Amino acid sequence: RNKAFHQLRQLFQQHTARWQHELPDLTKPQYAVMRAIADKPGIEQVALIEAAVSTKATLAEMLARMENRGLVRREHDAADKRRRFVWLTAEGEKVLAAAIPIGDSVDEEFLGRLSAEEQELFMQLVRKMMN
Template sequence: MSDLETLPGHLIRRLQQIAVALFSTRMGEADIDLTAVQFAALMTLRDHPGLDQQTLAGMIAYDRVTLGGVIDRLEQKDLVVRETSPTDRRARILNLTEEGRQTLDRAIPWVDRVQEEILAGLSDEEQAMFMTLLSKLTRAGNELSRAPLRGR
């Protein structure tokens, strides 16, 4: 039987738990009602306005069906609006509202702080190496995911 502390999958899951806890704590301190996935959706819509839900799901590596609930909640909070595509009446495109932009602007410094806290146990050199290796691993395993990352 393996020692859990030697299993990469276990340690990655633990780091994810830590990251989510930090994110939730910091958003609570800032009085911002956002989850990490909602933040990712808002950031991507800010950078790529007018995406459809399927494309957005691919760009943040999230299951398309589950993302529907995320978008529903963002729409209820008046952070995102769904509109009929001008080129395909069957498609719905997503855009940030002004409230969505303001919320995102308020959240970014707090999210930056979370990133610093996640990496705080590493030296600057170790942080750079960790990020390089983490990026390499996620790219290498992308197609193994239930929701692979897809470009636009």
């Protein structure tokens, strides 16, 4: 189709289909949340919304599941228990460390079809299009 955002969703679906086959227990939003916590241990939960590309409700559901699976621990602001700080557990570090080369490989199946200049330009257009 000639609609750029339709073809973009089609590319996204192919990338998601490969991701779910290679990492059946870690979606891309879950993976991004773990990468963002690892990049800033103790990050505020609210700041983790933008860092991982999520929403308040979706992140809350996601962190509850990771917490129940021993992958994430959280602490609270004593002045405001609605504020929370997030760390990866040791098990969460192992899960993320094993997933990174897999996620990189899935990304590479698509980005590797582009030259370095094409990859840089693709990124530039996406940022140019964003608000």
